[PDB]
Amino acid sequence: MLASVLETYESWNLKKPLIPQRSRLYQPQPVGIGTPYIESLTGYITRIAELHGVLPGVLMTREIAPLVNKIYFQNGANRGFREIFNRSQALNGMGEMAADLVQVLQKLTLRDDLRFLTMLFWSNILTPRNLFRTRKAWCPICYQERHQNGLVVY
């Protein structure tokens, strides 16, 4: 029944630190970097929409259209952006729409290698005449092999 020591103690200073601002959307690494089998920007938009559980059109209309500063982008976010889907071949192209989509996706995702997914590197050497399809072309064997092996489909 002796006397103990009345220690004191210390505080914890519960203050959360400051972190860099997070990307609005996710940051999936593009498939095919450094490989002749690189993924397209439109495919990247579709994949990032699938990861978010929303349809790609909804994602573009409600999150990509407002960020752009063009009249037909803001006015097209309340009507159905059929302009960007009927002319989606230029999203992976060497033009201004491709550059603007790359920049807005970079701002949304905080990535630095999105311009490789397009042909902006070949803007001054390649012409847009007969270069891009109007229709989607896919290899069904590629989809089946990617899904069976457990890899992501792109």
Binding site: S4, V5, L6, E7, T8, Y9, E10, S11, W12, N13, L14, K15, K16, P17, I19, P20, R22, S23, R24, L25, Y26, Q27, P28, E50, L51, H52, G53, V54, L55, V58, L59, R62, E63, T109, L110
Partner: protein, 302 residues
Amino acid sequence: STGFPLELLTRPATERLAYFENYTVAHPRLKEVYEILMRTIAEPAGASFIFVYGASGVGKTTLRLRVEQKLTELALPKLESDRARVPVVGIEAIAPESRYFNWKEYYTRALITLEEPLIDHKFDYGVVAPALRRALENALIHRHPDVFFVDEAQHFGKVASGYKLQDQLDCLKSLANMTGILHCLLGTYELLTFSVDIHFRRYCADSPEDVQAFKSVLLTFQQHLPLAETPNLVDHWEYFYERTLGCIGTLKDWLKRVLSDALDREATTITLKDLQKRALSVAQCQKMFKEIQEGERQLSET
């Protein structure tokens, strides 16, 4: 220093209240549980549930805040390049208005706290709220939180069914299995109604070491109280244990009440009647002790 700054006396009373309200004493139980939780988080040993107990007033929420801040600052060097990497997500369970816990609301609040866009526009790609469930699963996989804190986890048991009490947790079990996200369910002793178990034990009077720890935290509380004259409090340790049962959390808010009353009267010290004015009710402590005794008996199995 170990004492409160002497320059706050000339400062307004609101500044003294703000200073004392933010002081979080590191009693041995708090730091011991913090070390155990950090060890479990660093190496999970394949577990996916970090159930933590403790009667109201032990300090679970502040422990959660401390762990959140520590994990955020630990990850801080590596979020400069890696984005969409929120370190830790901490949410609070909703008490259902109906008889059964709502899982759609849980999913939507978990999505909101993750800043996930377009929650109203979710889609199900082939159960309660399959679209929201898949969205939360994907958000946990990609954002990759270290831990997923769920405070007030005792509200998960609001099902009123013995054959459904354990099955109510299947949603969280499957969400933790397929996303690999540690779920640390902080709750009171009701959570024992059902995996790593941690006990946030109070300072029971039977063990003299707990009495010594309670007197230590009481003294370090009295040292940081911003008054002109330091109020003697260790003498009525018996009183401070009767209305507190040994919880360092409700002791803090009791002292906050008394200090605010003293500051509003431009007083200089604390007497017994000041503590009696803002003390817990006689019946309140009895109910609290009954609940904590039930929890301790439930956890007493060896």
